[PDB]
């Protein structure tokens, strides 16, 4: 379980998402499909986009990272008491979707990225480490939901 100072540490630097989410999630995704290319093609809506620059353009792929940025707040702002809010999650990702855990943690790595280039003064690495642990315990539990589900993930 996270101590009540890491959950501190997750909540304090996701407030500045929640300043701009829309601009957090453009970031995020983007570098998701930078760093893993093979991930875009998950995307039905998004699998033709061909540069950053079209990435950056696509009004749909904004509302998309607000979409998952949304849900993903609610899930820390749960600081670990998330069942509810994983069961519709793990469901559409695991059945329709078919998102790996690896893929998860593709996305894990690209939110921590994000947030170490877009707030270099003050993500250190005990921020980064509870930020970490945070998104750990929500793939463990997504993983736990794959397998009741019947997804091998
Ligand atoms: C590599 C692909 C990938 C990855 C890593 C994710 N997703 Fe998912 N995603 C999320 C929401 C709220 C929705 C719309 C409702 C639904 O269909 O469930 C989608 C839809 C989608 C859709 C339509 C697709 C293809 C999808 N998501 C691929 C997808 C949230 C998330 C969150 C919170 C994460 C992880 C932090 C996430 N997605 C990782």
């Given at each position: 379980v996270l101590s009540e100072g890491e959950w501190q540490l997750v909540l304090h630097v996701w407030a500045k998402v929640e300043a701009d989410v829309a601009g957090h999630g453009q970031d995020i995704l983007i570098r998701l499909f930078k760093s893993h290319?093979?991930?875009?093609?998950?995307?039905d809506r998004f699998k033709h986009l061909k540069t950053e620059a079209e990435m950056k353009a696509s009004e749909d792929l904004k509302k998309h990272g607000v979409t998952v940025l949304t849900a993903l707040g609610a899930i820390l702002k749960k600081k670990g008491h998330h069942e509810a809010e994983l069961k519709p999650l793990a469901q559409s990702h695991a059945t329709?979707?078919?998102?790996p855990i690896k893929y998860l943690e593709f996305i894990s790595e690209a939110i921590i990225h994000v947030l170490h280039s877009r707030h270099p003064g003050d993500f250190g690495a005990d921020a980064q480490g509870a930020m970490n642990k945070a998104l750990e315990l929500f793939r463990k539990d997504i993983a736990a939901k794959y397998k009741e589900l019947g997804y091998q993930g």
């Open positions: 290319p093979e991930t875009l093609e998950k995307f329709k979707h078919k998102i």
